[PDB]
């Protein structure tokens, strides 16, 4: 069947603080948190999509994440989501993770890097659940009524939902310029890098292989990997490549459904 998560990639966005009070571009940036389920279940949204390995195969243990225009994968274990206490992870698919957290004033998600280094993001969120009914109990009893309530299910059938997707912008880089002696070289690897230089009418246009300048210094030429060929996400932390926009559509998992609470 359709494997829609083949034209999508993890990306790198700007997280407010990475668990230490300092801000840096993390691969596990947190987008909006949705909590319209009565029993108190959250739909946290990553940036680094999970459940699908680097080779675009469904795996229960590998999750993709972006690392400098290069995709790797990390073990699904060590995916820790927490609030004032320590949450419980229910669902896992795509960008979205389901959790039931104790009350608190923030939440963070983190996972080990390829070299086993924690990559965390922390967002301010006032979580305080109130169970359906007229009593503010904590855990379910072994004798009681049944009251209707709503929750997020684990089904991934047709849902009638949308995410806007677009092609990634011209990612800039500077580690690909190497000044040897009065000339620079551009690294390759599949990245059809775009360039713009000021030295002697310069050079406008995109290459696909190595190139030499022979004329000017480093601080005139530039690297702008274009990539394309994969939809990223429509996030406010990463720019667009064109004014009239392109836009796509993907269905989010875990719809909302009726159950009964005790």
């Amino acid at each position: 069947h359709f494997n829609v998560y083949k034209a999508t990639r993890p990306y790198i966005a700007y997280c407010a603080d990475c668990g230490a009070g300092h801000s840096c571009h993390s691969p596990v940036a947190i987008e909006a948190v949705r909590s319209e389920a009565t029993d108190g279940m959250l739909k946290i949204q990553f940036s680094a999509q999970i459940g699908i390995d680097k080779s675009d195969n469904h795996d229960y243990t590998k999750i993709r994440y972006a690392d400098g225009h290069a995709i790797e994968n990390a073990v699904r274990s060590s995916l820790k989501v927490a609030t004032s206490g320590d949450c419980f992870v229910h669902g896992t698919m795509g960008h979205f993770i389901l959790a039931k957290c104790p009350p608190g004033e923030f939440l963070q998600v983190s996972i080990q890097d390829t070299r086993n280094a924690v990559r965390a993001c922390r967002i301010q969120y006032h979580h305080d659940p109130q169970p359906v009914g007229r009593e503010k109990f904590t855990i379910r009893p072994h004798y009681g009524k049944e009251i209707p309530c709503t929750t997020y299910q684990q089904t991934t059938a047709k849902t009638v939902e949308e995410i806007d997707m677009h092609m990634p912008p011209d990612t800039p880089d500077r580690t690909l310029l190497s000044q040897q002696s009065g000339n620079v070289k551009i690294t390759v690897g599949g990245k059809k890098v775009k360039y713009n230089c000021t030295c002697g009418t310069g050079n406008v246009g995109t290459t696909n292989s190595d190139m030499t300048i022979n004329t000017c210094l480093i601080e005139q030429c530039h690297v702008s990997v274009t990539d394309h060929k994969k939809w990223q996400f429509n996030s406010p932390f990463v720019p667009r490549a064109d004014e009239p926009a392109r836009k796509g559509k993907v269905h989010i998992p875990f719809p909302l459904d009726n159950i009964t609470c005790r």
Partner: protein
């Protein structure tokens, strides 16, 4: 009115037309960042609840 009951009003649950009034405003981005800042009065439905 923004911030109270019926800030956004839809003539029917299936109606396409929508009237929203929540004092959405945009602010200049900080230097060296790409974030599109904005400010908005919170939902009127939640405060009515």
């Amino acid at each position: 009115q923004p911030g109270r009951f019926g800030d956004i009003q839809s003539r029917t649950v299936e109606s396409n037309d929508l009237y929203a009034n929540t004092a959405l405003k945009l602010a200049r981005p900080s230097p060296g960042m790409v974030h599109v800042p904005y400010t908005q009065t919170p939902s009127g439905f939640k405060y009515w609840l």
